[PDB]
Design a protein around this motif. Structure first.
Motif: not given
Ligand SMILES: OC1(CNc2ncnc3[nH]ccc23)CCC(F)(F)CC1
Ligand SMILES: [Cl-]
Length: 167
Positions: A41-50, A57-62, A67-73
């Motif tokens: 969930l690193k929203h750096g570029g592409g659709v996710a970055g946009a 940046n609230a999406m990134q904070v959430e 990830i800290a709780t659940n680990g990667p998808l």
């Protein structure tokens, strides 16, 4: 009846428009917007970055707390998080990234996540910087998703090719 406007109807349940998914989301405020996520969930570029930029940046904070709780998808997996100012919910879906060597067969598994939601605004999974053929992604979408999906294609030239080549 819903508030999606200007879409071409491809099948019973799939619709497509040349549009910026960020601007579409801000206008419609759909129940679900799909993010083209990666497993971290690193929203750096592409659709996710946009999309993340549009949330200030609230999406990134959430996402970092998730990830800290659940680990990667998993590649092919998803999670439901807040839609912030763009939608009620954001469904973060991980399609395979061809530029990482990931198995394109996982694209069908990724699209299956859409079936848990009656209506979605979405990009083409694994398109753009994820390196898959967008014509293929559209075919998998049509053959996998049974719920109502409104596909936003940012590139006008790509939109025209997807329509003209659609079987
Ligand atoms: O649409 C694609 C993904 N990228 C975005 N889609 C919608 N809205 C967006 N906003 C910022 C990026 C972005 C996937 C299909 C394609 F390959 F044909 C063109 C790119
Ligand atoms: Cl992209």
């Amino acid at each position: 009846v819903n508030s999606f406007s200007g879409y071409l109807k491809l099948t019973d349940n799939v619709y497509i428009k040349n549009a910026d998914i960020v601007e579409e989301a801000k206008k419609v405020k759909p129940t679900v917007v799909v993010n083209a996520a990666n497993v971290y969930l690193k929203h750096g570029g592409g659709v996710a970055g946009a999309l993340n930029k549009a949330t200030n940046n609230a999406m990134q904070v959430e996402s970092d707390d998730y990830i800290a709780t659940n680990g990667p998808l998993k590649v092919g997996g998803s999670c439901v998080l807040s839609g912030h100012n763009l939608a009620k919910h954001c469904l973060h879906v991980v399609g395979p990234n061809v530029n990482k060597g990931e198995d394109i067969q996982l694209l069908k598994s990724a699209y299956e996540n859409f079936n848990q939601h009656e209506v979605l605004l979405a990009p083409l999974l694994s398109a753009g910087i994820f390196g898959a053929d967008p014509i293929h992604s559209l075919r998998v979408c049509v053959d996998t998703v049974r719920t109502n999906v409104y596909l936003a294609v940012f590139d006008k030239n790509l939109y025209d090719k997807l329509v003209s080549s659609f079987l």
